[PDB]
Design a protein around this ligand. Sequence first.
Ligand SMILES: C#C[C@]1(O)CC[C@H]2[C@@H]3CCc4cc(O)ccc4[C@H]3CC[C@@]21C
Ligand SMILES: C#C[C@]1(O)CC[C@H]2[C@@H]3CCc4cc(O)ccc4[C@H]3CC[C@@]21C
Lengths: 192, 195
Amino acid sequence: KTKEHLMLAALETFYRKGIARTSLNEIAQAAGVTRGALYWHFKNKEDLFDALFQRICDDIENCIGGSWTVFRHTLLHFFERLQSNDIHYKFHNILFLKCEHTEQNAAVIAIARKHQAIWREKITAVLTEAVENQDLADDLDKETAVIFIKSTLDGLIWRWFSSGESFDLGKTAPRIIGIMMDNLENHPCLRR
Amino acid sequence: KTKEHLMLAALETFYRKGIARTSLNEIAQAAGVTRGALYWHFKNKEDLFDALFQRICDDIENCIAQGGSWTVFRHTLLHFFERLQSNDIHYKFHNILFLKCEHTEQNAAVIAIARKHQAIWREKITAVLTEAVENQDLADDLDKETAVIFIKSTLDGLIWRWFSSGESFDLGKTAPRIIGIMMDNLENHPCLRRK
Ligand SMILES: C#C[C@]1(O)CC[C@H]2[C@@H]3CCc4cc(O)ccc4[C@H]3CC[C@@]21C
Ligand SMILES: C#C[C@]1(O)CC[C@H]2[C@@H]3CCc4cc(O)ccc4[C@H]3CC[C@@]21C
């Protein structure tokens, strides 16, 4: 509804000036409703940030040969959406570059920690399927596999945002993912 | 003397407050000097920042101890993530560099310094990579530019996740197994080769 109209304002405002440096007052202006108006939908910056983190995870879910083989396909669909989808870009930008771990952003990082943790639970289930489906190894270490993908894939993201889009993400990302997949399958520093 | 006294005052404050909401003044009422004794030593923030970033690189490059060539990069890698745990200054610094340094137009001043140090790395990596290909450790067709991205992304990604996760996992046990996977990759994997 008009909610999404109020959100794309906060998303946009988080993106021009960062989260801690943003005020509800300001967000209310971007979508041109009254500070009393948006309070009806969100009570503070954090609800809006929460609503935003949501709307990204819904896209990713709603973008899905084998099961394992499909996984990669979502992983690559994810990295392009980062580039061509206007919001996936701006959000992860704000998530990675404008969310400083201060007190003034204390409640907001809590919100984000929840979501990246549901992502981890959602990573475990995937690898769980691929072990039973014969795609992966009876022996795969899982706890260390989580760190590996998040380390590998977040780290490509941060590298790119903190380097001002200094390389050609679409060319690089499949290769890093290809090498990560080759690793989850074969390499043994990933075995229990 | 009081040159170093301010240097940690900046580090503590930057840590307990993030870079941007830290005034040159605050760093002094923490150090015990006045604004003049501050300014005498430092022109502005970005240069107290410049000065810490160097000291980390200094500590880092001043630890090269011994074998081989490529066999040493591995050593200063494992030696890097160890310091990130045991060395209060190196921990507080990348805790700032990775978390409390937001990409706004105020920090814009100091993001240049950061970029500047971060690009020296890129060439000192591309250097290590070159001396490994010569010394026949890596292959000749090693797309050395993609190696550069690969390496930092992998290792920055390790650092970032660990930091941002709230240090939820044992970097002692993870890092060697991470570096190991990355090392064997650079040596052996065919998606890091040009033609
Ligand atoms: C958030 C986050 C990340 O650490 C960076 C990109 C994220 C994956 C993108 C696509 C995807 C697909 C799935 O089937 C399951 C999870 C994910 C994301 C969560 C973890 C990733 C690597
Ligand atoms: C800072 C930083 C990083 O992005 C994470 C770890 C860093 C390496 C540490 C040791 C090292 C040794 C060298 O001979 C040359 C470069 C480096 C650093 C490069 C930057 C890294 C990957």
